[PDB]
Copies of this chain bind each other. A is one copy, B any other.
Amino acid sequence: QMYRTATVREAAPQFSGQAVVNGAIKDINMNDYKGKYIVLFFYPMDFTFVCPTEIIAFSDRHADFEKLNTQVVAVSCDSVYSHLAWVNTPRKKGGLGEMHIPVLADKSMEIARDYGVLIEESGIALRGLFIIDKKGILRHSTINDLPVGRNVDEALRVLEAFQYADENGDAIPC
């Protein structure tokens, strides 16, 4: 209908808004991370009944991203004051105690609309993974459906495979 979303060859549309960094409502922009890579985790709903092992398995692996010159930016289309209550609720309660990831909140749904991972009649974002390299170009579009989950072992395989490639031109010999 418009916008054109975000392609895997062209530049990713920018994202901004309040976010939860280290337990606080701090404004987070895409331009704050220029020079690194950024990895978005759209995940649909807040406080969901599923023990959220998918999102925790990137806060537990956040040390693996600073080795690879990147910052994961988790994101959902729920209220930012609701994400702060979901970081602050302790685990074994459907909680995210001390999550070391900027959990964005596109409660405007202006951004998950842009990335094309929004179910419009449901308002929730499809479980999407988006790697933007430091040029500002979106480079990897992993969009799952709702019931399946993402993986950290593939989001580190592919994310390592760009910087091994883009240093060495654009061809991998082996």
Contact = CB atoms under 8 A, between A and B. Distances in A.
Contact of A154 (B7, B143, B154, B171): B154
A21 to B, nearest CB: 17
Interface string A66-91: 00000000000111111011100100
B147 A162 contact: yes
A28 interface: no
Given A78-B82, A153-B154, A147 B123 contact: no
Contact of A81 (B47, B106, B117, B126): B47
Contacts of A84: 47
B9 A119 contact: yes
A7 B116 contact: yes
Interface stretch (A29-37, A56-64, A96-104, A134-142): A134-142
Contacts of A173: 50-51
Question: Assembly of this chain: how many copies?
Answer: 10
A148 B139 CA distance: 9
Interface in A146-161: 146-149, 151, 153-154, 157-158, 161
A170 to B, nearest CB: 5
Nearest to A140: B144
A166 to B, nearest CB: 7
Contacts of A158: 144, 148, 151
B8 A117 contact: yes
Nearest to A4: B1
A114 interface: no
Contacts of A51: 173-174
Given A79-B82, A147-B172, 5 more contacts: A47-B79, A47-B85, A145-B162, A147-B171, A151-B157
